[PDB]
Each structure stands twice: as C-alpha cells, then as structure tokens.
Amino acid sequence: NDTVFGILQLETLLGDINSIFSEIESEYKMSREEILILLTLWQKGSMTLKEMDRFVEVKPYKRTRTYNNLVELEWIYKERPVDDERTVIIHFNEKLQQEKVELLNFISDAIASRATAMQNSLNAIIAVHHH
Amino acid sequence: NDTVFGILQLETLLGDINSIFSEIESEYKMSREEILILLTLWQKGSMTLKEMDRFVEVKPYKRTRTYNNLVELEWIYKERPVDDERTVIIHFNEKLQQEKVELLNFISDAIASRATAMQNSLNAIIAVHHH
Numbered sequence A, B: 001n002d003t004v005f006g007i008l009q010l011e012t013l014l015g016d017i018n019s020i021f022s023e024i025e026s027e028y029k030m031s032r033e034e035i036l037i038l039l040t041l042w043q044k045g046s047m048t049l050k051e052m053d054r055f056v057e058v059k060p061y062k063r064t065r066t067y068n069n070l071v072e073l074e075w076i077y078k079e080r081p082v083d084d085e086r087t088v089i090i091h092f093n094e095k096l097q098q099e100k101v102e103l104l105n106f107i108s109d110a111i112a113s114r115a116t117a118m119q120n121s122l123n124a125i126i127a128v129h130h131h
Ligand SMILES: [Cl-]
Pocket: A048, A049, A050, A051, A086, A087, A088, A089
C-alpha cells in the first residue's frame, strides 16, 4: 500500500537518524548524550550543568558519569563559580579545537552518505495523503 | 554555528517523528509497536507472529500483550494452522476496514501538519558540510 508504505518510512527515517548517531558513537567512543552536550556547548557556549540539563536529556543516574567522562576525554573542563560553590560551569577545552573540527567533519560525512536516502524517505512520508 | 545548528536538527527531526507516533498512540490507545504491526500487516498481508517479529522489533517480554491487545481492540484475529501448530497466524479484521481508512487519514493529517517543519529541519541537516 502506497499510503502505508509512506507512513512506514517514518520508521526508516528515524532509523537513518539513529544510525548516524550510532556511527559517531562507535567512531568516537561516546554516548548519544555526550555528543549532544558537546554540540550544545559549541552552539551556546559555556554554561552550568543545570542549564545544559535543559538542552540535553541526561537521566540523573548517568549525569555525573556523563560529564566526568567528557572531562576525562578532555573535551570539556569544569569551573566552580566563587560565589555559588554548588554550581558547576563547563567549558569546551580549546586545546581540542582540531579534534572538534575533525568530529564535525566526520558527522558531515555521515550525513552526506545518508542525505539522498533521507530525502527520499521524507518524500515518501510527505506524499502520504487522505483517502 | 551553521554546522552545529544543522547537526542538532537531527534531534529535532527525530523529535518530530516521535511526536507523530506519540499523537497516534494517545489517540488510538496503542503502542508504537502495535501501530507498526498494523501497518506492516496491511502492507504485507496475513503472516505468522514469528514472521511479524522480524519486521517489527517487539521486545520478547511485551510480545504476548502486544498481539493480545490488537485482538482485544478487534484490529486483528488469530488463526492456528492444522492440526494445531505452535504457529499463530494473524489476519486483519476486515470488519474494521473503515477504521483502517480513518486511522490512515489521521496519520496523514499528523504528517501534513509537520511536513514544512520536517523538510526545513532536513534542509538544515543536509546543508551540513566540511570545514
Ligand atoms: Cl550546575
């Protein structure tokens, strides 16, 4: 069925997107959440852990580990504001500027290898109509 | 960042797709797996549970309730090939043909409301490039 085919392509497109993340995750040995945090940090600049929590869904039991790991991979570092102590500010580690460019270029590659298929899927999805 | 914004739209498009499923789920009181099963059944025709499980990822612990609920909602019915196999064949309940059309139309409407947003997001994603 043509309508049914198009609707089912929602799942195909979702799969494309999760696959791209899978590719990044395996190459860079990071979690989905870590990748999203790094991207958000690059988009919005340094911020507190609490603030980042609003942009990226990190479940409480993996939170400490997630940020601690980003620190150990040397992607970020932490700062303690001198009049809050229980607030943690995170910053991109500029020493890893070249690695940042490399990662973004890899993500670009993974997107490019999927771009035609994703648009073809979205075309099928959007082509779904009433009957 | 043009690149970073575009990569982050992967998650936006993902959210769009899952919000469609959420909307159907709340309207029709079904899980995503049930929706995918019905669609696959309409696409491919009658088949065994074993065959359906290879088309739609349904966690083993959820399988029995998933199909039983489709039977309770009267979307499908079960058959056992002779003499009485361990095999369960499921069929679409043709009595619900008009219901099928209305569900498909509902999903079509959900897709149409998001078509502009999804294509804009995919445009941002595919625009991602090297530097
Ligand atoms: Cl904080």
